[PDB]
Nucleic acid binder design. Structure first.
Ligand SMILES: [Zn+2]
Ligand SMILES: [Zn+2]
Lengths: 56, 119, 56, 30, 203, 56, 237, 98, 214, 49
DNA sequence: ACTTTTTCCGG
RNA sequence: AGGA
DNA sequence: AAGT
């Protein structure tokens, strides 16, 4: 993100969500969780379609 | 390596052997030019390269804000102001060693605790 | 409960330092890669392992 | 976007290969 | 899976690890160079001066192929300059004259000459050398790892007891070959490529 | 049957071959896809029998 | 804007990692074969090597990049002057389009019109067109030599959303030039006022009505689902 | 997003005409090894020339846009490492205020 | 000694497996005969240099008393090893008319690198006798000993006739084994022959499949 | 100390539908994507006319 | 050189 | 265009 | 995303 200095391999820069849902997420933690979430939904959609033909 | 061109064509120079005197020549295949080789080396491959490690280090490198700072004392002037970066040789293998550029002398030093360099 | 949240914070705190320690160790060339792996691959495996150990 | 299209882009498409052996001048939008 | 006997012998595993893991001349080489060294008996390169002196005492091309090997790389995938050169020598047979710096020597070097028009021929040789040369192991078999798996096995007293073993995991497949290898169990070997199991062991 | 202008016959023949072809299968590799004056292509007998939603 | 020649030019690096003949050829618009870069600079005007290499590699101390450019010089060596470089390019059509004077004249035009259409599509701007082609080869090599990183096709700054207005621009253009040809048609018929204003109205309507951004009721490939009915379930929707 | 906007499309010339009068060497007259490290300038992917001290130019450009003179929607990026200064008048670019 | 020791280690192992295969086919071979140690192999088929003497290895084998009861017309076998890596039409015409004269039933040719296309053209030419080509380098390890390989049993013409009667099958209706199958080669399966495959079952303990040769 | 710009408000990364989610930062990543599809099926006054 | 599948249900 |  |  542009809110990071270059060559930052730290937990925070690479998406480690230190916080609990109860405490809340930081804008960085939120956006990273968001990328992670997106991958799962694309998988769900792709898997659902593949898995069907396999059954057939 | 460092290769030269013809001084009449500007077209590139190809090697030729002077079997008679056992000496290396560079000929021009456009005209009739020939010159003795300055080096015995005609080609170098280089597989584990170290050229590109510290590329694009302009004197404006201190101005880029996207770059991080550190309080590491400089080897040449002891200035605790440096703009570090990683091996710009964009290869898989590559070590995570740093290269600090001074903000006064503008000299390049590593965080390397295995070897000593000059690049 | 409050004391368990102190314990959890300091649980992440030590695993964050464990990551920094392996980060400085890898910037200093001292880090010795795992057989059949990039020096970086070897580092990331360890970082991702500490952060997920702490999550648990 | 539409504003740039009416105010400018439209007056431009109107004259580029407009001139025919008869060319097109200024466009008016009611 | 390791030969019946040597179950917990980690050093046995390492042997077969090296015996099968593929290593190329490219994987050891730092850089290769072509120099014009017209006299074979003496060298323009001052470092080399030493190497000629010995690999002479106790006709060919003037153009030289000089490649530098990496010490640390020659270490991980255990290797000797002797065995490296011996391969290069056994590859190009008699048409290529090979010399090499000793394992002790500070810099690792391999000098090669031949037996009108030469410049290009030598570059064709360096391409065979780097790419088309095997040093160690079986082809296709890449990253090889040692694993300490747990095998439940009947003890003398009769009870099945957790008695672990060293096992090799490959990042490539070549069954026909890694089976005929000494020091393994060609009764226990397994590949996830069942297309290969079908071809080698039957339907 | 009339005064056969030959090139005109091999021309009218090839067109009949086209229609008899495109009627059974309209989706041929050799690209002219017989189309109803509406742009919309003519539905092949093949297309009618073709899988998932379609006769069989 | 204007005609919009969506001609894409590729600068290919033949031969893979660890193979001899690491030649650089570039697929030029309206040209069958992939011409070696050197023939291009020569056809462009930049006749000698080194003058060609000056445009590609800027640092005379970057031996690594230059050794990489040596096979290119070898490939191109066969052609020598500007003329014989254009003739080689004219030999590869289109089809071929036989005759020497014809093939040479072609390639003169492909460079002016089809080659690097932005910058300029004019005449005497060979200087700019060369330095750029070189900038491309430089960037090509920079990646092969593991210095620059391979371009992320999915970086957002490299994308552009075509909004309402420019969607119409593409459409209006297509129809205005369709009217422009019907305008020439009635001017022709006048062997000696009947300018169908319907084509434009009906076209824009058809488009915004179906969502089929193509010409016209004969759709595919047109691009459908561009226009659509505004959802009104809630003010949010 | 709520703050996202799209570039409408401006004119490159008032920036091109400006750049020349500010230290840009035309591409027709470039000497790759005489002026070697020169920061190369592109306006909408069209390589226009080279600038000797890009730091001074980048500061004058930023001030025209921030004042009003150069359109605020006009994108202008200076990669120090790469030694390039790419400018964008280009209609389509998604922008956000900061 | 060097890496000459290994070309031997392997030729010994390949022989042991060739010995096993012949025993398994139903021929008379001892267990001590198979178990012939390395040092003892050297001291039989090794010259004045301690190098392999393949021309000596070659051995005739006969049917066990048991085999002539199941398959009466099951004749005699001959296994001819060759000392030349590339086997040519010259060394092949030898072995071929050897079987023809010595009225053999079957013959196995164990070659190192190849059997020339000229020589291979003579393999079917001598009926009712049959010939088998076998790359030495394959035989180094016995596939039949592997975990995954169950017991295959060649059926008699009377046994196959019965399998078909008992399960009311047409030849088609049977699971098939390829003529080129590692095990079908090891057992020298001819097209139409059936194998009984006795496999272990996590379900029943022992399950018997059948495969006809294609 | 290199900061060239500041973010107006981070909640502006969100678009129309997500901006109706209460505490979306205290939610699991997709639960928000689900809501930013459901609110388009809800009822209520869509216009005063 | 060249083809074909991809879970189930108001206009 | 939309639900599971 | 695979395979004649
Ligand atoms: Zn010359
Ligand atoms: Zn300093």
């Amino acid at each position: 993100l542009p809110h990071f200095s270059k060559d930052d391999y730290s937990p925070e820069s690479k998406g480690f969500v230190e916080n609990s849902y109860l405490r809340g997420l930081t804008p960085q933690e939120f956006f990273f969780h968001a990328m992670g979430g997106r991958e799962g939904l694309i998988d769900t959609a792709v898997k659902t379609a593949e898995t069907g033909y396999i059954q057939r | 390596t460092t290769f030269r061109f013809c001084r009449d064509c500007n077209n590139m120079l190809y090697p030729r052997e002077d079997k008679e005197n056992n000496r290396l020549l560079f000929e021009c295949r456009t005209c009739s030019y020939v010159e003795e080789a300055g080096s015995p080396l005609v080609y170098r491959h280089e597989l584990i390269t170290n050229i590109g490690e510290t590329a694009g280090v302009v004197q404006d490198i201190g101005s880029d804000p996207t770059l991080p700072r550190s309080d590491r004392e400089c080897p040449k002037c002891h200035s605790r102001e440096n703009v570090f970066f990683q091996s710009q040789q964009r290869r898989k293998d590559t070590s995570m060693v740093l290269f600090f550029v001074c903000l006064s002398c503008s000299h390049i030093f590593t965080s390397d605790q295995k070897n000593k360099r000059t690049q | 409960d409050g004391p368990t949240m102190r314990e959890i914070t300091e649980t992440i705190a030590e695993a964050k330092k464990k990551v920094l320690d392996v980060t400085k160790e890898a910037q200093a060339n001292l880090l010795t890669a795992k057989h059949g792996m990039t020096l970086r691959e070897s580092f990331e495996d360890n970082v991702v392992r500490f952060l997920n150990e702490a999550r648990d | 976007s539409f504003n740039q299209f009416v105010d400018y882009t439209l007056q431009d498409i109107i004259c580029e290969d407009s001139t025919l052996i008869i060319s097109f001048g200024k466009i008016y939008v009611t | 899976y390791l030969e019946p006997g040597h179950a917990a012998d980690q050093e046995q595993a390492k042997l077969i690890r090296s015996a099968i893991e593929h290593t190329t001349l490219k994987s050891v080489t730092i850089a290769s160079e072509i120099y014009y060294d017209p006299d074979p008996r003496s060298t323009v390169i001052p470092e080399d001066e030493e190497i000629i002196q010995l690999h002479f005492s106790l006709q060919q091309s003037p153009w030289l192929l000089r490649l530098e090997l990496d010490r640390a790389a020659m270490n991980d995938k255990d290797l000797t300059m002797g065995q490296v050169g011996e391969r290069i020598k056994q590859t190009f047979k008699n048409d290529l004259f090979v010399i090499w710096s000793e394992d002790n020597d500070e810099k690792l070097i391999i000098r090669c000459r031949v037996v009108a028009e030469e410049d290009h021929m030598l570059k064709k040789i360096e391409n065979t050398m780097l790419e088309n040369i095997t040093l160690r192991g079986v082809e296709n078999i890449e990253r090889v790892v040692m694993m300490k798996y747990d095998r439940k096995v009947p003890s003398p007293t009769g009870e099945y007891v957790k008695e672990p073993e060293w096992v090799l995991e490959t990042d490539g497949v070549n069954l026909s070959e890694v089976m005929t290898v000494p020091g393994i169990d060609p009764t226990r070997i397994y590949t996830n490529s069942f297309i290969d199991i079908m071809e080698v062991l039957g339907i | 049957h009339n005064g056969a202008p030959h090139h005109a016959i091999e021309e009218a023949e090839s067109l009949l071959q086209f229609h008899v072809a495109t009627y059974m299968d309209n989706d041929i590799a050799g690209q002219p896809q017989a189309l109803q004056k509406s742009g919309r292509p003519v539905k092949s007998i093949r297309a009618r029998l073709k899988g998932k939603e379609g006769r069989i | 804007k204007g005609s919009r020649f969506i001609s894409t030019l590729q600068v290919k690096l033949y031969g893979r990692e660890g193979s001899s003949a690491r030649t650089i050829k570039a697929t030029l618009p309206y040209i069958k074969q992939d011409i070696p870069i050197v023939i291009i600079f020569r056809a462009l005007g930049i006749i000698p090597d080194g003058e060609i290499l000056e445009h590609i590699c800027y640092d005379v101390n970057d031996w690594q990049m230059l050794e990489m450019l040596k096979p290119c010089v070898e490939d191109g060596f066969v052609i020598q002057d500007r003329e014989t470089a254009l003739d080689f390019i004219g030999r590869r059509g289109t089809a071929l389009g036989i005759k020497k004077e014809k093939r040479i004249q072609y390639a003169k035009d492909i460079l002016q019109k089809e080659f690097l259409p932005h910058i300029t599509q004019l005449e005497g701007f060979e200087s700019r067109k060369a330095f750029f082609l070189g900038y491309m080869i430089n960037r090509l090599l920079l990646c092969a030599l593991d210095r620059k990183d391979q371009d992320d096709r999915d970086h957002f700054g490299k994308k552009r959303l075509d909004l309402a207005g420019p969607l119409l621009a593409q459409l209006f253009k297509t129809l205005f030039k369709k009217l422009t040809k019907d305008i020439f048609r009635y001017m022709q018929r006048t062997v000696e006022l009947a300018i169908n204003a319907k084509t434009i109205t009906s076209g824009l309507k058809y488009a915004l009505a179906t969502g089929n951004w193509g010409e016209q009721k004969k759709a595919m490939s047109s691009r459908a689902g561009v226009s659509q009915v505004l959802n009104r379930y809630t003010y949010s929707s | 997003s709520l703050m996202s906007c799209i570039s409408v499309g401006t004119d490159p010339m008032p920036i091109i005409t400006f750049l020349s009068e500010w230290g840009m060497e035309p591409l027709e007259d470039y000497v790759p090894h005489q002026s070697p490290d020169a920061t190369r300038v592109f306006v909408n992917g069209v390589w226009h020339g080279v600038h000797r001290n890009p730091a001074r130019l980048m500061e004058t450009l930023r001030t025209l846009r921030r004042k009003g003179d150069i359109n605020p929607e006009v994108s202008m990026i200076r990669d120090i490492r790469e030694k390039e200064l790419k400018i964008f008048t280009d209609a389509g670019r998604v922008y956000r205020p900061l | 000694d060097q890496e000459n020791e290994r070309n031997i280690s392997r030729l010994w192992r390949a022989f042991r497996t060739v010995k096993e295969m012949v025993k398994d086919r139903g021929y008379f071979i001892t267990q001590e005969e198979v178990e012939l140690p390395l040092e003892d192999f050297k001291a039989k088929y090794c010259d004045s240099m301690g190098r392999p003497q393949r021309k000596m290895m070659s051995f005739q084998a006969n049917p066990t008393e048991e085999s002539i009861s199941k398959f009466p017309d099951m004749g005699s076998l001959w296994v001819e090893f060759c000392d030349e890596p590339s086997v040519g039409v010259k060394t092949m015409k030898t072995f071929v008319i050897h079987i023809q004269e010595k009225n053999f039933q079957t013959g196995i040719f164990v070659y190192q690198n190849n059997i020339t296309p000229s020589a291979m053209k003579l393999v079917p030419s001598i009926p009712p006798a049959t010939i088998e080509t076998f790359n030495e380098a394959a035989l180094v390890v016995n596939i039949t000993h592997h975990e995954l390989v169950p017991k295959h049993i060649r059926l008699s013409s009377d046994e196959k006739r019965e399998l078909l009667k008992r399960y009311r099958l047409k030849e088609s209706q049977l699971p098939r084994i390829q003529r080129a199958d590692p095990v079908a080669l090891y057992l020298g399966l001819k097209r139409g022959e059936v194998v009984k495959i006795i496999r272990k079952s996590e379900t029943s303990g022992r399950y018997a499949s059948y495969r006809i040769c294609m | 100390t290199t900061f060239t710009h500041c973010e107006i408000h981070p909640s502006m990364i969100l678009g129309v539908a997500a901006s109706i989610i209460p505490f979306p930062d205290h939610n699991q990543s997709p639960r928000n994507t689900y809501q930013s599809a459901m609110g388009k099926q809800a009822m209520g006054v869509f216009l005063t006319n």
